């Protein structure tokens, strides 16, 4: 049975606060760190149960996760069953056709021992909690770096920096979530280590945790906007409307959240807002060949690359349940300033903004790493298409800094190719393990 009282809340629910801080730390004097981990952190770690009840959301929601080197600093030599986690993300960078030479230097190594995720409706409240932690831990905790993040303002609340509504699609955990139309339904052990049908044996104290893949993904927003205007397909509407269509073709949803598979030529903001309808699709359409039809959604669209649905078989009618083991829970939040007047006018980025990307999964090789390397970065994925060369994911697809060839985006001609510069630039990140709450004051403090 899924013991949600013992699972950290960001994993299955998300913090859902206006402001978040990712506080990346090293451990000194581990015996002292441990005493404070047990006395000061464990009691204020927010659980799934706590966050699932709108009446027990804490003022400051706190989660904590440890890198491989952080667990080792705590004297934990156990095999958590994940080679990617053990090796650290810097060693995995070439899997994604990037180089750590481009990373924030603190990520390009294994000095980071963990991350504290703090979330609250104001930054003052976060800062007070950080000050309390630094006060009680003293020098046994050392801040290496941090990243502040926020829900975007006004009509962009819940949208990422390019302007698209985010956080729509997640796997439903069988026995825990009430599935929405079209939502994949997966065994708990796809996300939670040691939960139902996790095939990898874990240390006993690690049952109820998850691996957290963090990526600091800069977004080149003025450049993206200008690209869409410059490449907008011909049509009856305003130039901006035609540019908007191209952007929707790249993501697989309109900015409103409406999936293009269900509304391929025009936005439907009412559909985008409706969780009962906005995920209710499989990419299959009766009367169309799944292997060649890109009129509803390109084969290269971001969401189609990252959850293939009927492209990997299974039910043609919703819900499609394919590739459940390749599911990830996403808890990303935007970072950086909004686009400034001068950046928009010059079509040029000056300040860094983007997505503080967070993915949870029980097996890094099946989740984030797989989606990036085997799907998004693979010009021949999905398989069995005509033309066979789908191209790269236009949002996240990487090829060692080169422009990406992306096919199928133009509704007028599915064979038309575009060469697209990166609009998302990796600054690196790390793989962490978010332990069950019991382990925080338990094994990890022993
Ligand atoms: C700055 C970088 C990124 C941006 C701007 C971005 C944006 C989006 C947007 C707008 C959606 C549609 C909203 C939704 O369906 O919930 C989405 C969905 C999704 N993204 Fe990305 N994303 C980024 C990075 C990533 C990465 C690195 C991965 C994995 C390697 C990823 C995996 C997914 C998945 C699995 C979905 C849901 C697909 C589905 O279930 O249909 N995203 N993203």
Residue numbers in the entry: 3 to 448
From the paper:
Among them, Tyr-147, Tyr337 and Trp-377 are solvent-exposed, but Trp-105 and Tyr-285 are buried into the protein making their interaction with the dye substrate more difficult. Aromatic residues were changed to serine in the simple W377S, Y147S and Y337S variants (the latter with low refolding yield). Moreover, most of the variants show crystal structures largely superimposable with that of WT DyP, except for the mutated residues. In contrast, similar Tyr-337 and Tyr-147 variants (and the double Y147F/Y337F variant) only slightly affected substrate oxidation, and did not remove the high-turnover site. However, this does not seem to be due to modification of Tyr-337 (or contiguous Tyr-147) since the enzyme activity was practically unaffected after site-directed mutagenesis of these two residues. Among the 65 DyP sequences compared, 58 include a tryptophan residue homologous with Trp-377, and 48 include a tyrosine residue homologous with Tyr-337 (whereas the neighbour Tyr-147 is only conserved in 14 sequences).
